[PDB]
């Protein structure tokens, strides 16, 4: 959804992962859409 | 897993989950086994999937 702005860290173990579950491929379209160079910018961006 | 299937939960762990010893289970093979390679595969794809 728009507003359910949910992300990871870019080109990581947890991309891949879920690049790998064929069944979960459809929150991976979204996962591409929205996603963070590291981990620090993706807590301060959840902080904020 | 005893907690788990015990009845009436009168037996617990302490600290809610605490270990120790954070260790695991895998499967032993001779040295220099031919199959070692393989089965790491193996059960990496298989947590992976």
């Known amino acids: ?48 | 897993y005893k907690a788990g299937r015990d009845e009436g939960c009168k037996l617990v762990t302490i600290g809610s989950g605490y270990i120790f010893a954070t260790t695991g289970y895998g499967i032993a093979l001779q040295k220099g086994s031919p199959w070692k390679r393989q089965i790491d595969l193996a059960l990496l794809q298989f947590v992976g999937d």
């Open chain 1, 1 to 48: 959804s728009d507003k359910f702005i949910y992300a990871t860290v870019k080109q990581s173990s947890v991309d891949i992962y879920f690049r790998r579950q064929v069944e979960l491929s459809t929150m991976y379209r979204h996962m591409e859409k929205h996603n963070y160079e590291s981990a620090a910018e993706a807590i301060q961006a959840v902080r904020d």
